[PDB]
């Protein structure tokens, strides 16, 4: 085989040296807003509600009598 094409594994490094010594990298679009909050992805939490879904409803049922 030939693991010469695997060299890309090193290229990924791209010399991690993102520092602002002389100029750096500041743009006008860098100081812009960017709100976000993907809570939908955390739907698994709903699984906990399954335990006590109508549990609270049982309280109002007591009023029936």
Describe this structure in a few short sentences.
Residues 42-63 are annotated as: Fusion peptide 1. With 65 residues, this protein is mostly helical.
Task: Write a structural description.
The record marks 41-42 as: Cleavage. The protein is mainly alpha-helical and 65 residues long. The chain has one domain. The chain contains 3 helices and no strands. The longest helix has 5 residues, at 57-61. The termini are far apart.
> How many distinct beta strands?
0
Approximate shape: elongated
Number of helices: 3
First-to-last CA distance? 81 Å
> What percentage of amino acids are in beta strands?
under 5%
Return the structural class.
mainly alpha
Main beta sheet strand tally, sense and closure: none
Helix content: 10-25%
Question: Could you give the order of the helices and strands?
Answer: HHH
* Count of structural domains: 1
Question: How many whole angstroms does the radius of gyration measure?
Answer: 28 Å
Region (Fusion peptide 1): 42-63
Glycosylation sites: 27
Protein name: Spike protein S2
Site (Cleavage): 41-42
Helix and strand topology:
Layout: H1 8-11, H2 46-49, H3 57-61
List keywords for this structure.
mainly alpha; 20% helix; 65 residues; viral protein; monomer; monomeric
């Amino acid at each position: 085989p030939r693991n010469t094409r695997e060299v890309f594994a090193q290229v990924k490094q791209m010399y991690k040296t993102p520092t602002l010594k002389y100029f750096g990298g500041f743009n006008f679009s860098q100081i812009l807003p960017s709100p976000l909050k993907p809570t939908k992805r955390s739907f698994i939490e709903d699984l906990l509600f399954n335990k006590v879904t109508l549990a609270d409803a049982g309280f109002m049922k007591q009023y029936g009598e």
